[PDB]
Structure 1
Amino acid sequence: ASIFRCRQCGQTISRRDWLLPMGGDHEHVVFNPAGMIFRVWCFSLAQGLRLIGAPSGEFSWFKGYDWTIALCGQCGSHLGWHYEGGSQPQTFFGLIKDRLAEGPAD
């Protein structure tokens, strides 16, 4: 269990080694304006996504960061968000834990 794939299709997305403890925990639980709860895992790095549109600061869950929707690049499943425009780090990924599958490295 060292890499994370898209649960819906298998696309390679990230690695346990790339988990990032933002504010002391790699895990953050948050809701959007529609009341949906997400268990977000922060990653320094991810791949196999497609970042949609341009960044927005509106309702951002992480102070100083602007967000872009991150879809699985293969199947289009909403996997999380890419954060940018902030400080230490300037950028990171917040990925929705239950949308990934963990397993052995390729």
Structure 2
Amino acid sequence: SIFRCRQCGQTISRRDWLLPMGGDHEHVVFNPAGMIFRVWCFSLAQGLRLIGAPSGEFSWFKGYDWTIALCGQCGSHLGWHYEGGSQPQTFFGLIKDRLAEG
């Protein structure tokens, strides 16, 4: 029901806050460093620290710019905040295997 940071237990999100972006909350993507992530889209998240300004470079989601999302408590990379788009304007893409569910 609740998602916490797997490393430290920081409160991050909720199953209720999952967002089906393009018809599915789960998107399997790879970055240019060939790292594969199972990304769960959330309308809402808390307890993160968004670092830097947004970038569109290699964005997996058309029309959205990303900011790196760390755990605000432990600094572990938990995913990205997406902004600059439409329906919705913003959302979170969190790496499922870096969260723990209650």
The answer to whether TM tops 0.5 is yes
- 1:100 maps to 99
TM-fit CA distance, 1:10: 0.2
TM-fit CA distance, 1:19: 0.1
TM-fit CA distance, 1:11: 0.0
TM-fit CA distance, 1:17: 0.1
TM-fit CA distance, 1:50: 0.2
Overall identity of the aligned pairs, in %:
100
TM-fit CA distance, 1:39: 0.1
* SS of the residue 2:97 aligns to: helix
Cα RMSD over matched residues? 0.2
TM-fit CA distance, 1:80: 0.2
TM-fit CA distance, 1:64: 0.1
Deviation string 1:63-89 (CA, Å, 9 cap, x unpaired) is: 000000000000000000000000000
TM-fit CA distance, 1:6: 0.0
TM-fit CA distance, 1:27: 0.1
* SS of the residue 1:21 aligns to: coil
Q: List gaps (5 residues or longer) in structure 1.
A: none
Normalised by the length of structure 2, the TM-score is 1.00
Normalised by the length of structure 1, the TM-score is 0.96
- 1:71 aligned to 2:70? yes
- 1:45 maps to 44
TM-fit CA distance, 1:90: 0.0
* SS of the residue 2:93 aligns to: strand
* Structure 1 segments (4+ residues) deviating >4 Å: none
Aligned length: 102
